[PDB]
Amino acid sequence: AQNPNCNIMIFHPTKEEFNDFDKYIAYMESQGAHRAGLAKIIPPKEWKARETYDNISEILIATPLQQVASGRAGVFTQYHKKKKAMTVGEYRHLANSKKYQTPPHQNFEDLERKYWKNRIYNSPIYGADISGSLFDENTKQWNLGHLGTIQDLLEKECGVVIEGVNTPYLYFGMWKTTFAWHTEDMDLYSINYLHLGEPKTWYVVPPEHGQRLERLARELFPGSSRGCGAFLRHKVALISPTVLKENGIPFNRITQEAGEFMVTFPYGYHAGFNHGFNCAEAINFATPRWIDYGKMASQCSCGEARVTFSMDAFVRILQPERYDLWKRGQD
Ligand SMILES: CC(=O)c1ccc(O)cc1
Ligand SMILES: CC(=O)c1ccc(O)cc1
Numbered sequence: 001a002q003n004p005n006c007n008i009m010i011f012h013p014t015k016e017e018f019n020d021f022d023k024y025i026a027y028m029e030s031q032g033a034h035r036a037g038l039a040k041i042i043p044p045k046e047w048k049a050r051e052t053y054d055n056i057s058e059i060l061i062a063t064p065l066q067q068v069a070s071g072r073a074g075v076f077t078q079y080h081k082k083k084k085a086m087t088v089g090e091y092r093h094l095a096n097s098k099k100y101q102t103p104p105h106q107n108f109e110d111l112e113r114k115y116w117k118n119r120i121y122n123s124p125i126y127g128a129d130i131s132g133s134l135f136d137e138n139t140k141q142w143n144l145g146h147l148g149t150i151q152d153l154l155e156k157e158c159g160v161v162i163e164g165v166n167t168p169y170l171y172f173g174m175w176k177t178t179f180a181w182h183t184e185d186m187d188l189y190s191i192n193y194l195h196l197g198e199p200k201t202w203y204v205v206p207p208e209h210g211q212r213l214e215r216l217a218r219e220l221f222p223g224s225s226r227g228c229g230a231f232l233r234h235k236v237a238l239i240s241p242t243v244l245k246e247n248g249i250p251f252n253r254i255t256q257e258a259g260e261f262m263v264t265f266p267y268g269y270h271a272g273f274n275h276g277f278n279c280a281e282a283i284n285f286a287t288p289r290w291i292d293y294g295k296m297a298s299q300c301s302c303g304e305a306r307v308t309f310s311m312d313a314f315v316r317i318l319q320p321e322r323y324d325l326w327k328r329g330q331d
């Protein structure tokens with residue numbers, strides 16, 4: 001078996017290898033990349049997402065989210081308080097202000113230490129979940145707005161035609177902005193391109209060990225667990241690498257820099273944080289190997305999770321028994 005220790009693998013495709021997206025994902029998996037739950041892909045030196053980022057300041061963040069923590073430094077939840085709209089230019093200025101700016105630090109490791117020590121004592125503002133794309137329409141390779149759709153994948157694999165669309169989302173971040181432990185909707189893949197700015201650090205649990213993380217989460221957030229059989233779907237729980245280690249949970253970490261892609265694989269739990277002002281673009285996608293994960297994906301039915309229009313069809317076709325109780329939660 002390839003990659004038996006489930007290490008995060010890093011790939012350097014040539015420009016020729018960068019032409020066929022599906023083929024390259026399949027290649028990475030042939031080398032065992034999916035066992036980690038996360039892979040890094042460094043694009044060929046000849047490639048670019050767009051010519052410049054000099055003209056993005058007038059993008060609107062309609063609903064910036066203030067991420068307020070509760071709990072202890074290594075085990076906490078965060079809730080999202082809605083703030084007034086601001087442009088990306090205004091957001092960048094806010095990120096760089098004394099209140100919100102990245103502190104002096106020696107290296108990535110020092111900054112990671114500071115994050116886990118001090119995150120709960122601040123409430124950074126995240127410009128997350130904004131429909132749109134920053135890829136130039138003329139960028140033909142790995143353009144996250146031009147991928148084959150999940151609906152078409154299901155149709156090719158299973159012969160059923162379904163409603164729904166999937167499009168990319170932009171994420172504007174600042175120091176300490178945080179993504180909670182989660183897998184993707186319907187345990188899909190995700191792909192994430194860091195367009196500009198400061199790094200993003202990721203933590204990931206191998207898919208084969210995801211249930212170990214779930215068991216620890218139930219122990220650490222007992223009220224939440226009683227309220228919902230899949231509460232990690234709420235995307236509000238954080239557990240530090242120190243706490244994961246203390247509890248013997250297998251995981252890895254890696255830092256993504258501007259100009260790099262990350263792919264998360266079906267049922268690969270991940271969490272992380274931004275180092276300073278940045279912008280990422282991400283979208284879900286599927287392959288033939290995903291179908292069996294989609295069939296088995298846990299669902300939140302307490303109603304907190306509340307997901308996309310397109311998820312309806314996935315649950316309806318892949319999980320017909322659940323579909324009744326699930327849509328009861330969505331509605
Ligand atoms: C990366 C960059 O050039 C850039 C420019 C203007 C902004 O408002 C935000 C980012
Ligand atoms: C000029 C340039 O760097 C550039 C990059 C990406 C494009 O899709 C189109 C032009």
Ligand SMILES: O=C(O)CNC(=O)C(=O)O
Pocket residue numbers: 128171178179190191192264270280282283
């Ligand atoms: O970048 C973020 O805040 C969160 N991104 C993801 O969870 C992803 O790309 O799958």
Ligand code: NI
Pocket residue numbers: 182183184190264270
């Ligand atoms: Ni994700």
Ligand SMILES: [Zn+2]
Pocket residue numbers: 227228229230231233234300301302303304305
């Ligand atoms: Zn729930």
